[PDB]
Design a protein around this ligand. Structure first.
Ligand SMILES: CCSc1nc(-c2ccc(OC)c(OC)c2)cc2nccn12
Length: 271
């Protein structure tokens, strides 16, 4: 739909950018207000940094993926500089929040709760035939009520034939990415399941880097021998075995996200 008919388009004047939360190669993210009263996050495109078409494809995906557990598209401004305006998440990134005084005090019970909210969001994505491909604690946001949502849909893709195949050159973070995706560029929902397992280690260690003390080649080398990440300090064995299920050699032997949700809810109500 053209901008003059798109329900998501808003006049730039409705927005007041108050506090810059981040700045990078491709633009800025601000906390702001829509029509004076409603707090929003606003991502801006640095003109010439990258294609505006590529920038806006993120918002177009979000139009197709609406759910309580996913950060919600709020609006777009499709004239330069381009803004993607989204649901504001007051406690920021999960990776950051887990290190603050509040996040530090969380019981294993609340951690397992949050793990299950994240799985619930991914179960939606799974049911809708999408994949995320960038699933990790940096890409989970936390509300003021300590609930969690999936964010950053820039790499997310609709899958018709089960499989998305990236290009020869394309690079992905080694620690978080399923072997098949790193080796062949092939992604499925099961590649997200493997990433969820890594994300679980981030939850339980309060945002520490996976594979403590290992370089990328050491990780690759270890996985090929059949080793998986060493038991994080203070990880319940139950959760550790659930991470192992996510790290199964064959994609198709990895559990579904609805299963993960289910199990984690059981882990939560039992604690
Ligand atoms: C900047 C990454 S995107 C992003 N960050 C925060 C956020 C909230 C509180 C913070 O407190 C430190 C923070 O860190 C800069 C980020 C909130 C938020 N809502 C939607 C996207 N958001």
């Amino acid at each position: 739909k053209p901008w003059w008919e798109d329900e998501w388009e808003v006049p730039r004047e409705t927005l007041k950018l108050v506090e810059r939360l981040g700045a990078g190669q491709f633009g800025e993210v601000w906390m702001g207000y829509y029509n004076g009263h409603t707090k929003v996050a606003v991502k801006s495109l640095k003109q010439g940094s990258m294609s505006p078409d590529a920038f806006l494809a993120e918002a177009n995906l979000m139009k197709q993926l609406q759910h309580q557990r996913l950060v919600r598209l709020y609006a777009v401004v499709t004239q330069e500089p381009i803004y993607i305006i989204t649901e504001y998440m007051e406690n920021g990134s999960l990776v950051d929040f887990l290190k603050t005084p509040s996040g530090i005090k969380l019981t294993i019970n609340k951690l397992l709760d949050m793990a299950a909210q994240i799985a619930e969001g991914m179960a939606f994505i799974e049911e809708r035939n999408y994949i995320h491909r960038d699933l990790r604690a940096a890409n989970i946001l936390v509300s003021d009520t300590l609930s969690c949502k999936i964010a950053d849909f820039g790499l997310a893709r609709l899958i018709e034939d089960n499989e998305y195949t990236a290009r020869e050159g394309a690079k992905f973070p080694i620690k978080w990415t399923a072997p098949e995706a790193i080796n062949y560029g092939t992604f499925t929902i099961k590649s997200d399941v493997w990433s969820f397992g890594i994300l679980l280690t981030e939850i339980v260690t309060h945002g520490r880097i996976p594979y403590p003390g290992m370089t990328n080649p050491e990780v690759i080398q270890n996985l090929e021998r059949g080793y998986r990440m060493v038991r994080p300090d203070n990880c319940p064995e139950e959760l550790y075995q659930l991470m192992r299920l996510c790290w199964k050699e064959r994609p198709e032997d990895r559990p579904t996200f609805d299963y993960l949700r289910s199990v984690l809810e059981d882990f939560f109500t039992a604690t």
